[PDB]
Amino acid sequence: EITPDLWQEACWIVISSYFDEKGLVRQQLDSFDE
Amino acid sequence: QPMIYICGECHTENEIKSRDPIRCRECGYRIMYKKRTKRLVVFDAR
Amino acid sequence: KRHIDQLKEREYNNYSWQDLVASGVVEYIDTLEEETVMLAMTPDDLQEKEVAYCSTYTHCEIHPSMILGVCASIIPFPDHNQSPRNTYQSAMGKQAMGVYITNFHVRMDTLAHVLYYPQKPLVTTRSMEYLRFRELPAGINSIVAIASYTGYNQEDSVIMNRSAVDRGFFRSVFYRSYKEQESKKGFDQEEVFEKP
Amino acid sequence: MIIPVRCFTCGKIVGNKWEAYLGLLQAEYTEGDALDALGLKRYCCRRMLLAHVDLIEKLLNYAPLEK
Amino acid sequence: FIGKIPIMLRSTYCLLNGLTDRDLCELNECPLDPGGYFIINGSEKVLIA
Amino acid sequence: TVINNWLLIEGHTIGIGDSIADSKTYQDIQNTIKKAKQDVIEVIEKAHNNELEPTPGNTLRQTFENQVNRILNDARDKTGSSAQKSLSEYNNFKSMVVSGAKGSKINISQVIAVVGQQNVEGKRIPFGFKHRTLPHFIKDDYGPESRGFVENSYLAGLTPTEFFFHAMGGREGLIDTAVKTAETGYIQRRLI
Amino acid sequence: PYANQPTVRITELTDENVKFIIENTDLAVANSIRRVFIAEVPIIAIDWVQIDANSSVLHDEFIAHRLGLIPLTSDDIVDKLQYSRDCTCEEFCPECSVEFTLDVRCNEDQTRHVTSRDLISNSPRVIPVTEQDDILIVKLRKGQELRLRAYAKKGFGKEHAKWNPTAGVAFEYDPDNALRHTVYPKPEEWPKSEYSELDEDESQAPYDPNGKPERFYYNVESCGSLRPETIVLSALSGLKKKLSDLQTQLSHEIQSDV
Amino acid sequence: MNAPPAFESFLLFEGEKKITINKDTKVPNACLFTINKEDHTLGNIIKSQLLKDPQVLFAGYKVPHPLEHKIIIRVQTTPDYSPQEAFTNAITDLISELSLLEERFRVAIKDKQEG
Amino acid sequence: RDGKLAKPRQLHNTLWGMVCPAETPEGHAVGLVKNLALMAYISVGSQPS
Amino acid sequence: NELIGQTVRISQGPYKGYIGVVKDATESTARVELHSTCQTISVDRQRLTTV
Amino acid sequence: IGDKFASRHGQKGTCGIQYRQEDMPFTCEGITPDIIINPHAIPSRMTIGHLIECLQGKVSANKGEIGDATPFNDAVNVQKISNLLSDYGYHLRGNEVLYNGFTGRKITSQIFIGPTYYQRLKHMVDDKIHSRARGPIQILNRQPMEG
Amino acid sequence: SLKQRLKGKEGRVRGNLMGKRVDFSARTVITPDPNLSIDQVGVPRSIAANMTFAEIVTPFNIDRLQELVRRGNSQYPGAKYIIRDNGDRIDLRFHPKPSDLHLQTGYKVERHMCDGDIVIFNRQPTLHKMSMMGHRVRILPWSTFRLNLSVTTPYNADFDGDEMNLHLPQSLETRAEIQELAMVPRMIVTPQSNRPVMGIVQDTLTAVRKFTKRDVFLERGEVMNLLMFLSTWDGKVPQP
RNA sequence: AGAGAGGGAACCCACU
Ligand SMILES: [Mg+2]
Ligand SMILES: [Zn+2]
Ligand SMILES: [Zn+2]
């Protein structure tokens, strides 16, 4: 189902997933890689 | 007269000479680290 | 909710951010496409029925705090400040002494400023967990008092505690490297390391 | 890096509390319960452990240059 | 051999790509370093976008 | 010397208790903001139906813009006045403003009651996107919140859109400060 | 024209702190006694650190700093020690110093904690205070080591904060401000002190113009270098000694003028 | 660099007088007592004790600068009564009450530790 | 640098979420030098075929 | 002088116990670069004791 | 003194003076400030976030948890922070009765106190102090050197 | 080229002839100090032990200057240069034989500057004449320029990392000129708007506004503590 | 007891 009011802790889970997958310097590394 | 250097990655020590190319004997690592001085140090604990 | 359930249990389900991108839940919107998108700020306010504003949302912002940079993310309550103050703090935050790197004992950096007892902030943001500011911090939590006094915190100055400083308060250490090599040349000038 | 020996404000000896603080944390206590289980009433002594980052454990991973 | 081109750290053609943090600490490189910079004559260079 | 040494006995501070007004003042501020917002909305609905008549000397869009800016400035002034009637004579913001040492009434109004309208180049926040200021607003939205008016104060904090518009205003101020210096110095050099 | 008679009433006495009340004395006397608690009480602390060898991740001066702030048991030796600069010895002796030796090398894969226990004194009485765990000086990886000799000398809190025996000296007079020295804007919001004696209906005591500060409440928590009561005894002795020396110089100056 | 050594707070030097008496010339029976290498932790008590005399018309003290370790205690007493006498009586009164306080603290310790 | 105009330096509306609104060098390079936002990502580009 | 560049130990005075290196020396006094503090201070030759 | 410190809100400033612990003011308990900042730095700069950080720091250091300071929360306003601080035996708005460090008489005003997060900037005064007197001289023209 | 060497803001005419590098100048951060007069600047010792004033040997000061020369250099009270009658410089930092350390009337002694010496204190954007004023030297321990609070307003220096430039007038004639023209007491009222530029700065202003209120009353001890700090007090406690 | 110093130009980041 949906996240009615535990959204405050649910959004930071996806933020953590993004920054564990990508990182802070994906621009430089991916640009030089391509 | 020879100076003792610590062989970087090897962490072993060896002698060195004047006008001697800087090489370790274990694996020829180029980076040497000079040993700590033998004279006394005294620190005010402040 | 199932996405959150599979996303909390990372390193077990191998459910990454890329899997959520593949699931058609999030997508990357660039600046051209922002001109033709109806963007919800937060879901708890802009999907519930009210005196309706638009009721035609296409995308929703993940979290508004992600509009800020890396140095504006370490500011506690940056929306309560004034914007020039936030800019000046963004300037100063790239200048605070601290453990700039973990292997600083190996690096022969010029002008290495490191600190004795850096601390994580008691008042932190959620975004510091992703800049890893709690692992290589820059600054110490200090018991400040905002008081007029003898007259040495007059015009943008602060009175410090001598005993606290003697207890290692902000006592930093400054490293400076010096490099020099000799030059084998055409025998006219020949540098060599020796005690003169 | 390593835990300060004294609280900056008080001078209360807090350097001997860090390992016990970690033990109380891994023994399923709250941080507030662990602090006053160690006996830290003043919040200036509480911030010394509550906001410390034990960075020296990161520095001990590297092999010592001198040996 | 055409020539040597610089490599920014933590790339897919750097030595320490995908290495574990223990391996990085064995190489005297910290896992905290994000890379993305070139080492030119020992100087760390950043290509500003 | 002697006033500092008396200040040692007296002591002077500033805090978060000096930035909070009683709930009656907050109710007054919120009522004024709501009334002004509804007034702006009804002015907008007059402008849509061509019932707004143009002031002699400018276009209809500006009769409208003058009306909106007038209403919002009146709201800012009224909320500031109603905020600065509730210091209770011990508020340190009033202590510094009345003495004239640091600050003014505008700072008190912005901290306690409302930041006010944010401006770029003397007018409201322009439509950077296609006929909207930010992608969160519907197109052709000439309301207070869409065009840069901030109804929150520094005590309550700004919503992200208000934060961005406030950052725009601060950027304009910093640009002015950074560009003024060289021209002023050159004028001084020529004059001397 | 003379000094009032003060009196002491001790509410509790623990190995950490002492809590007492001093009545019938002036405010300046009470504040000075607090300041002499913080500063003028001499204890024994490490001040001369000679690093024979060091391979730890922490540098030499960081280790010397951490050795400075370690409290030492000086309950009875500090009264016998001369100040180091006042001694006629050959720049160090057991009459103005206490010798400590640290000699630790880590020969195991476990992280070896060089604690305060590894500090070995030649004087059995002057030992580090550490039931409680030891004070962590430096952690050691395998292959690292540190050897040092540290001389501790007598000093007080004005010189450096490592000679401060007190963890915290709480001091307050008139907990319900009948003197009205502090003026609350809204006294209802203000929590009562530990020594307040007003009922929960009342916020603060009525004002009296003829009153004066008296009945000062102290909470002197020691850091372990001294027992909390010998801190007070040494403080009173030190303040009396300072006044006596001031009187002696005063007598010399008066005799010089006449 | 320019950090004063930590012993500048309390240690005198050769050619430094601990106490210097300068007779004031503005009003009769007034003296400035310049105490070297001291702070408020002496002058405050001396001032408070000198205010308890019924024959001291003015009792004050100030530090010229917190970075320079000296205080000046200004004493104006009633005529027929020298300010130096008031000073040397204030010191004795302070010593008396402090010794009495120390003895009473000893008695309190003996009461508390022995029940 | 050193231009008396303001339009290349101002905080445009389309800087929302892509670039930080607060962080900038406040010298003579206000608005010109910017710092990227957190979740903002520069598309590395692919072939249109 | 002979004392120049000689590790000395202040054996008398307020700075007693400090190890330093003599930078300048005279008949009366000598400047000592202290190993502990970031400061070079001058003391009498009668107060110095070489290692 | 002269060393340049700064908050996390653009509230920079050099060290004016350093008092010892006995000269620094103190609360009813033994807590003295580590830093004492100017009250006049607030009203014109309008860093209310600094005050809120101080209040949340008191709440966090008493509660035993690292406080949350995300900008756009709506779950943490100043009133909730004050209500959480009131439970730990403090004033609602973080004010605390400081006693004077010199005279001992309690300060008439109630000083706002609490823990913030201060940053020491790279800028010392030893790196910036320099004097000169007929030292090195340029060769192109006989004027003193630069830097 | 030569035209490029002359035409610039870094050339010969502006860059070298108009604004040139000068000896006898110091630059360090300023920190506030309310315990010294408005015409006093608290300079560090290491700055005062490096900037010298050429004092002429006269029979009035021959013993004092002789003692300062006996101290030599780095004994703060000391000097570093002693200039002969024929313009010959003799070092005091290199410790010559005691034979050529005499003083007769006519010698110059470049001695380290002490308390009471006059210096020129300025900030960078000297937009008016009160941005560059003369102060009296006070020797304070730490390594900053301790200057007063009310002089902030003409200087526009807010102590948040500001560093000032301190020039030393070398001649006695220019010292008297600075004392008689560019003293901050003589630069209180500006000619641009016939008003003072010093004023009373923030904290003193607020404390004096709260101080002079009607409901402010002072106990006798507090009154004596306050009157201790009046420099212009004739020693008479006013009637309450 | 043997006593002076030099580079120079270019370009980046901050500092008030
Ligand atoms: Mg400034
Ligand atoms: Zn090897
Ligand atoms: Zn001895």
HEC letters along chain F: CHHHHHHHHHCEECCHHHHCCCHHHHHHHHHHHHHHHHHHHHHHHHHHCCCCCCCCCCCHHHHHHHHHHHHHHHHHHHHHHHHCCCCCCCCHHHHHHHHCCCCCHHHHHHHHCCCEECCECCECCCCCCCCCCCCCCCCCCCCCCCCCEECCCCCCCCCHHHHHHHHHHHHHHHHHHHHHHHHHHHHHHHHC
With a CB cutoff of 8 Å and minimum separation 6, the contacts of C55 are C49
Contact L161, L168 (CB under 8 A): no
With a CB cutoff of 8 Å and minimum separation 6, the contacts of F1 are L34, L35, L229, L230, L231
Measured distance CA(K67)–CA(K72) in Å, rounded: 15
The angstrom resolution of this structure is 3.9
CA angle G80, G83, G89 (to 5 degrees): 95
Q: What are phi and psi of F188, to 5 degrees?
A: -60, -45
Amino acid at B13: E
Distance from CA of D26 to the nearest CA of B (A): 35
Instruction: Find the ligand nearest to L123 CA.
Output: 1
Ligand 2 center to B11 CA (angstroms):
6
| Strand M within 7 A of K145 CB | yes
Contact B17, B5 (CB under 8 A): no
Distance from CA of C84 to the nearest CA of I (A): 8
Helix (H, G, I), strand (E, B) or coil at J43: strand
User: Can you spell out the DSSP letters for H44-85?
Assistant: HHHHHHHTT-TTEEEEEEE-SBTTB-EEEEEEEE-TTS-HHH
Helix (H, G, I), strand (E, B) or coil at C119: strand
Strands F116-117 and F149-150, by their bridges, are antiparallel
Nearest to C124 by CA among C77, C158, C60: C77
Q: What distances in angstroms separate CA F66 from CA F73, F123, F124, K52, one per listed residue?
A: 10, 10, 11, 37
With a CB cutoff of 8 Å and minimum separation 6, the contacts of J45 are J3, J25, J26, J27, J28, J29, J30
- State whether residue F191 sits within 8 Å of chain L by CB: no
Beta-ladder partners of F120: F123
Strands J40-44 and J29-34, by their bridges, are antiparallel
Q: Which fold has domain B3-46?
A: Rubrerythrin, domain 2 (2.20.28)
With a CB cutoff of 8 Å and minimum separation 6, the contacts of C53 are C46, F138
Residue C187: left if φ>0, alpha if ψ -120 to 50, beta else—which one? left
Strands K67-68 and C123-124, by their bridges, are parallel
Measured distance CA(K102)–CA(G38) in Å, rounded: 13
Question: SS in 3 state form for chain L?
Answer: CHHHHHHCCCCCHHHHHHCCCCCCEEEEEEEECCCCCCCEEEECHHHHCCCEEEEECCCCCHHHHHHHHHHCCCCCCCEEEEECCCCCEEECCCCCCHHHHCCCCCCEEEEECCCCCEEEEECCCCCCHHHEEEEEEEECCCCCEEECCCCHHHHCCCCCCCEEEEECCCCHHHHHHHHHHCEHHHHCEECCCCEECCCCCHHHHHHHHHHCCCCCCCCHHHHHHHHCCCCCCCCCCCCC
Which residues in chain G are contacts of F16 at CB distance < 8 A? none
| Strand M within 7 A of I2 CB | no
Q: What distances in angstroms separate CA E13 from CA A28, A32, E9, E10, E16, one per listed residue?
A: 14, 10, 9, 8, 9
Domain G43-161, CATH class in plain words: mainly beta
Terminal Cα distance for chain E, rounded = 30
CA–centroid distance for D39 within its chain: 13
Contact G155, G204 (CB under 8 A): no
Nearest to F119 by CA among F65, F59, F53: F65
Question: Does B26 count as an annotated binding residue?
Answer: yes
The radius of gyration of chain B's CA atoms, rounded to the nearest angstrom, is: 14
- State whether residue D6 sits within 8 Å of chain K by CB: no
Nearest to H47 by CA among G211, L222, K19, G35: L222
Q: What distances in angstroms separate CA F83 from CA C194, F71, F90, one per listed residue?
A: 77, 18, 15
Ligand 2 center to C194 CA (angstroms):
25
Strands L118-122 and K95-96, by their bridges, are unpaired
Nearest to C157 by CA among L81, L12, K13: K13
Contact H88, G254 (CB under 8 A): yes
Contact L192, L129 (CB under 8 A): no
Beta-ladder partners of G120: G101
| Strand M within 7 A of J1 CB | yes
Give the nearest chain H residue to K130 (CA atoms): H1
Q: What distances in angstroms separate CA G43 from CA B45, D13, G65, G78, G85, one per listed residue?
A: 15, 15, 17, 6, 15
Instruction: Find the ligand nearest to B5 CA.
Output: 2
Measured distance CA(G246)–CA(H11) in Å, rounded: 14
Name the helix (H) or strand (E) containing G52. strand G43-54
**Closest nt to residue I24, judged CA to C1':** M14
Output the six-digit token pair for F102. 């640091």
Output the six-digit token pair for H47. 């001032």
- State whether residue D4 sits within 8 Å of chain C by CB: yes
Q: After which residues is chain G broken (C to N over 2.5 A)?
A: 130
Residue ranges, comma separated, of all CATH 2.170.120.12 domains in chain G are: 43-161
- State whether residue C101 sits within 8 Å of chain F by CB: no
Q: Which of C30, C44, C156, C188 is catalytic?
A: C156
DSSP code of K103?
S
K&L contacts, CB < 8 Å: 88
Residue of F7, F9, F14, F162 to mutate for K, most K C-beta atoms under 10 A: F14
Token pair 């000893």 is at which residue? Answer: H106
The radius of gyration of chain E's CA atoms, rounded to the nearest angstrom, is: 12
Specify the experimental method: cryo-EM
**Closest nt to residue L124, judged CA to C1':** M16
Beta-ladder partners of L82: L90, L109
Portion 1-49 of E in contact with C at CB < 8 A:
28-33
**Closest nt to residue K128, judged CA to C1':** M15
Buried b (16+ CB within 10 A) or exposed e, D20-57: ebeebeeeeeebbebbeebebebbbbbbbbbbbbebbe
**Using CB atoms, which residue from C148, C151, C156 is nearest to L160?**
C156
Token pair 């005075």 is at which residue? Answer: J13
Contact C113, C97 (CB under 8 A): yes
Amino acid at L186: R
With a CB cutoff of 8 Å and minimum separation 6, the contacts of H109 are G10, G13, G229
Terminal Cα distance for chain H, rounded = 55
Helix (H, G, I), strand (E, B) or coil at H106: helix
Token pair 């359930």 is at which residue? Answer: C5
**Closest nt to residue E48, judged CA to C1':** M12
Residue C92: left if φ>0, alpha if ψ -120 to 50, beta else—which one? alpha
With a CB cutoff of 8 Å and minimum separation 6, the contacts of I7 are none
Domains assigned to chain H? 1-115 (3.30.1360.10)
Contact G243, H91 (CB under 8 A): yes
Measured distance CA(L168)–CA(L119) in Å, rounded: 5
| Strand M within 7 A of L203 CB | no
Measured distance CA(C37)–CA(C55) in Å, rounded: 13
**Using CB atoms, which residue from G45, G60, G143 is nearest to B43?**
G60
Residue E41, classified by CB atoms within 10 Å of its CB into exposed (0-12), middle (13-18) or buried (19+), is exposed
Give the nearest chain A residue to C2 (CA atoms): A1
How many Cβ atoms from other residues are within 10 Å of residue J39's Cβ? 15
Which residues in chain C are contacts of L153 at CB distance < 8 A? none
Measured distance CA(C78)–CA(C82) in Å, rounded: 8
Residue C43: left if φ>0, alpha if ψ -120 to 50, beta else—which one? alpha
Which residues in chain L are contacts of H66 at CB distance < 8 A? 35
Length of chain K: 147
Which residues in chain K are contacts of C150 at CB distance < 8 A? 17
Measured distance CA(H63)–CA(L228) in Å, rounded: 10
Helix (H, G, I), strand (E, B) or coil at G258: coil
CB contact under 8 A, C156 and L203: no
List strand residue ranges (DSSP E) for E1-49, in order: 38-40, 43-45
| Strand M within 7 A of I29 CB | yes
Nearest to G193 by CA among G212, G168, G222, G173: G173
Residue C166 annotated as catalytic: no
CA–centroid distance for C162 within its chain: 30
Crossing angle, helix K48-63 and helix D43-50, to 10 degrees? 90
**Using CB atoms, which residue from H1, H7, H11 is nearest to J38?**
H1
Contact J6, J22 (CB under 8 A): yes
Residue ranges, comma separated, of all CATH 3.30.1360.10 domains in chain G are: 1-42+162-258
Nearest to K54 by CA among K22, K91, K107, K3: K91
CB contact under 8 A, B18 and C194: yes
Q: Distance from residue K140 (CA) to nucleotide M8 (C1'), in Å?
A: 10
Output the six-digit token pair for F31. 């009522």
Beta-ladder partners of L86: none
Domain G1-42+162-258, CATH class in plain words: alpha beta
Beta-carbon neighbours within 5 Å of ion ligand 3: G 87, 89, 93, 95-96
Which residues in chain G are contacts of D49 at CB distance < 8 A? none
| Strand M within 7 A of L162 CB | yes
Measured distance CA(C16)–CA(L43) in Å, rounded: 62
**Closest nt to residue L10, judged CA to C1':** M9
- State whether residue J4 sits within 8 Å of chain B by CB: no
With a CB cutoff of 8 Å and minimum separation 6, the contacts of F161 are C41, F133, F134, F136, F137, F145
The CATH H-level (homologous superfamily) assignment of domain D1-67 is Homeodomain-like (1.10.10.60)
